[PDB]
Write a protein that binds this ligand. Structure first.
Ligand code: NA
Length: 330
């Protein structure tokens, strides 16, 4: 089997991407944030505290003929940005882009934090990291990908995120028309439950490539590129008037600037992030201070190849017995 779904930026800054997902019988379509950084499929629901729901589409398990309470199961998750959600669990039929899983754990939110309530465009998350991070207790549940894997023509999914444009999530096949040149594959560690790999280095603009090992995760549910403080300082040093602002919470730069590109290594291959990808616009409406798309990972405890980096590439998440990542230019 295979599936193929379009993913659409939620706003003019590409803060996140939503993908339609069919849940239940008859189908209830919810727009989910596909997150290679986490392993829970959770939704706004008919059980979500009514004061915490502000325009999201909700899943109603009582309207699904295939929904079954997963008796006694609960979940609770905390994300890197301080957001959280929790609730109980149903199993139901879930389809992405024509690919169907029966008996998927659908985590129904009773409670969501303010950041989720305030984002009307995101109806929930669909985790695509390793199932060892799933939060369901007392019986840990599998991801959508882990449930589909054995039915797929190839045990892979790919992420092809757009810059200020729609892109694609594919399951069970490589679209050889979606990328230029060849795919370079690199080793993955599953030890922390993430798609954790080691970049071979970086360059700023037209500068010389610095060979250096940068361990990080490929995370479609993080907006920005978070790298070590040395690498981020070298990047913003090339932008006149750029500085780290304790008040704003990261590097800002004059909105009048032209940003340089940033290059990261994948083995002997190179992925170039165009400067425009690194502009996240005014810090507040009408400000001439703009927020940077490359920020320090110091304090987060991990480097994160978020959407700024991944949307410059065609990315293969290879879930074979030994997982690997692949990157191609596009
Ligand atoms: Na922000």
């Amino acid at each position: 089997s295979t599936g193929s779904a379009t993913t659409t930026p939620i706003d003019s800054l590409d803060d996140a991407y939503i993908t339609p997902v069919q849940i239940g019988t008859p189908a209830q379509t919810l727009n989910l944030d596909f997150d290679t950084g986490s392993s829970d499929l959770w939704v706004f629901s008919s059980e979500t505290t009514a004061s915490e729901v502000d325009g999201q589409t909700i899943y109603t398990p009582s309207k699904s003929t295939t929904a079954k309470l997963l008796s006694g199961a609960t979940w609770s998750i905390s994300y890197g940005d301080g957001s959280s959600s929790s609730g109980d669990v149903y199993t139901d039929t879930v389809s992405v882009g024509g690919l169907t899983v029966t008996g998927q754990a659908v985590e129904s939110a009773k409670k969501v934090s303010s950041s989720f309530t305030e984002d009307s465009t995101i109806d929930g998350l669909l985790g695509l990291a390793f199932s060892t991070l799933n939060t369901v207790s007392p019986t840990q549940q599998k991801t959508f990908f882990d449930n589909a894997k054995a039915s797929l023509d190839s045990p892979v999914f790919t992420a092809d995120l757009g810059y200020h444009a729609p892109g694609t999530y594919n399951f069970g096949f490589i679209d050889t028309t979606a990328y230029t040149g060849s795919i370079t594959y690199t080793a993955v560690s599953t030890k922390q439950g993430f798609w954790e790999w080691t970049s071979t280095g970086y360059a700023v603009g037209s500068g010389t490539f610095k060979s250096t090992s940068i361990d990080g995760i490929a995370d479609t549910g993080t907006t920005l590129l978070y790298l070590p403080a040395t690498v981020v300082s070298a990047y913003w040093a090339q932008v006149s008037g750029a500085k780290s602002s304790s008040s704003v919470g990261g590097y800002v730069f004059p909105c009048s600037a032209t940003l340089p590109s940033f290059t990261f290594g994948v083995g002997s291959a190179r992925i170039v992030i165009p400067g425009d990808y690194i502009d996240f616009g005014p810090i507040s409406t009408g400000s001439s201070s703009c927020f940077g798309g490359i920020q320090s990972s110091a304090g987060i405890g991990i480097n994160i190849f978020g959407d700024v980096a991944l949307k410059a590439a065609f990315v293969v998440f290879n879930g074979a017995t030994t997982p690997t990542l692949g990157f191609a230019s596009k």
